[PDB]
Design a protein around this motif. Sequence first.
Motif, PDB file in Angstrom:
ATOM      1  N   UNK A  59       0.827  -1.197   0.000  1.00  0.00           N
ATOM      2  CA  UNK A  59       0.000   0.000   0.000  1.00  0.00           C
ATOM      3  C   UNK A  59       0.865   1.251   0.000  1.00  0.00           C
ATOM      4  N   UNK A  60       0.354   2.370  -0.542  1.00  0.00           N
ATOM      5  CA  UNK A  60      -0.929   2.463  -1.249  1.00  0.00           C
ATOM      6  C   UNK A  60      -0.800   2.022  -2.700  1.00  0.00           C
ATOM      7  N   UNK A  63      -1.335   0.871  -9.120  1.00  0.00           N
ATOM      8  CA  UNK A  63      -1.525   0.069 -10.323  1.00  0.00           C
ATOM      9  C   UNK A  63      -2.018  -1.305  -9.884  1.00  0.00           C
ATOM     10  N   UNK A  64      -2.098  -2.236 -10.835  1.00  0.00           N
ATOM     11  CA  UNK A  64      -2.450  -3.613 -10.512  1.00  0.00           C
ATOM     12  C   UNK A  64      -1.295  -4.376  -9.879  1.00  0.00           C
ATOM     13  N   UNK A  65      -0.090  -3.809  -9.890  1.00  0.00           N
ATOM     14  CA  UNK A  65       1.022  -4.419  -9.182  1.00  0.00           C
ATOM     15  C   UNK A  65       0.663  -4.590  -7.713  1.00  0.00           C
ATOM     16  N   UNK A 161      -8.775   4.293 -12.317  1.00  0.00           N
ATOM     17  CA  UNK A 161      -7.368   4.617 -12.510  1.00  0.00           C
ATOM     18  C   UNK A 161      -6.730   4.908 -11.156  1.00  0.00           C
ATOM     19  N   UNK A 162      -5.757   4.087 -10.769  1.00  0.00           N
ATOM     20  CA  UNK A 162      -5.127   4.194  -9.461  1.00  0.00           C
ATOM     21  C   UNK A 162      -3.852   5.024  -9.472  1.00  0.00           C
ATOM     22  N   UNK A 163      -3.479   5.601 -10.620  1.00  0.00           N
ATOM     23  CA  UNK A 163      -2.201   6.302 -10.725  1.00  0.00           C
ATOM     24  C   UNK A 163      -2.071   7.418  -9.695  1.00  0.00           C
TER      25      UNK A 163
END
Length: 574
Positions: A59-60, A63-65, A161-163
Amino acid sequence: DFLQLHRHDSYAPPRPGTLARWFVNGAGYFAAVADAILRAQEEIFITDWWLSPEVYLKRPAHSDDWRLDIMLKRKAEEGVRVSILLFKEVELGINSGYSKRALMLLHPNIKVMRHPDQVTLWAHHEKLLVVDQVVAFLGGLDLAYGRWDDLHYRLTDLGPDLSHNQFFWLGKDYSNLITKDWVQLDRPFEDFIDRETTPRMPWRDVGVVVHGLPARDLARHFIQRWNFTKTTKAKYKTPTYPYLLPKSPGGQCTTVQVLRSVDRWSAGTLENSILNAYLHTIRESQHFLYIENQFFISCSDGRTVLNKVGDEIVDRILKAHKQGWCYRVYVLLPLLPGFEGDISTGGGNSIQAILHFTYRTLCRGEYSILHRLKAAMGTAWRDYISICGLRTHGELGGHPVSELIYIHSKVLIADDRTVIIGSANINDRSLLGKRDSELAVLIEDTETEPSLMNGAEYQAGRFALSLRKHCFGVILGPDLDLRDPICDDFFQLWQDMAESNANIYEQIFRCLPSNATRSLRTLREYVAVEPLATVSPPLARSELTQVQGHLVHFPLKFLEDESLLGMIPLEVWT
């Protein structure tokens, strides 16, 4: 190694020279799990009472990584065979069907079996992940929502979108299981409580990783359960679910022995070696016990509660009192059980049922620890046992807020030398063997370091002392002397802080449970009062500066005037 049972009647023998490392809270544990998954070359074995496929291991997220399902899919794409055993609930809101379908869809090399298919009260409760049968993680942490936490024990998380994401707990991961149980798990990234108004509940837990022979022993337990589960129904008997076979960073060299609870229904064989190791460790202890556990339901009456852990604690304290030796028992429990309910109106019948059996162990009735200690020594019981919980505070909506720290750990420490870490709660469900299936490791130190024990020089074990000091340090919050865990000065300091913090939290938040509400009658009037936290946020903040650490006394009188116990079998709660 497996032609006959061993110490504590375990299927696995003690393993000297084992590299082991403990984890407090999910942050370090889940990150180490991620690192181990990444380096898998052959096999990954996973057991979970609940597995959330979309949970992030670091965390946080940006991305999907580091998302669990993505990580497993990539390893399977590399040729790694992933085998997963999930508990099949009675549609409980864990939704194992969703987890199974999502994991099976990821890649052909990922295989999931669920169990049991029959109606039963009992569950598969052990939490396990083994990589290449050589590195094994276990403890109280499922790879599930709500479990990730760190020393900050954040009550708020305000910053597909987690960017640009800054949240530590995305969607369903932000949760307070006492405020509301999980719903709509097929919408993993949607909130189900109001982030802006509703604090999450901090999660405290303990895990461990072991290398070498004990990791192979743990792999053998998984293989035994896997091949047994294959025989349970026609779909699993086919080669789609292959027979599994045993393969004949901060870690401390220790002696480690694997222990378990299993029965005919759960594994095709009988074992209660976790219980055996608990009773032996308490009986043979010489100086102190530190117990951090989600449940504390014990003291046998031969009918409704059966396990003898509480009875061994009573006998050990009575023996130390008779011989005049210094002996301390620290018990750390969640202030409320982890069930959805409104404590301001009594908590509901699930919370009250657990509360009944919790107080039955502690201080109410002829079998309770305190009643039997008082019988032999009167008020002197306070010299030998301290029962506490944990609480923290933060800010939300412009005023202080508070919440208990949920102790989900299942750990015991004895004499700064011996540690038990696993999934087994202190109740009949975990310990009898016949009920839930469970895992634990008994970790005994062979390397030591000079320490103190009631003022005398004492060779303490490296693994146990480091873990115990880490628990004490986080719980007590710089100039604190944590070398001696039983001396009069420290034990008084522990009790003084637990009482002082509890009093401040009650003065500012009027939080429950509390010794001020001994009946539902008085509870009704008590909760109708607005606490100082919102009446005067400045005055509340000033008083809160006097809190040190998270330690609070566990209120022994809460609702003591009520019965607290309809057609559900009582053994559901024990």
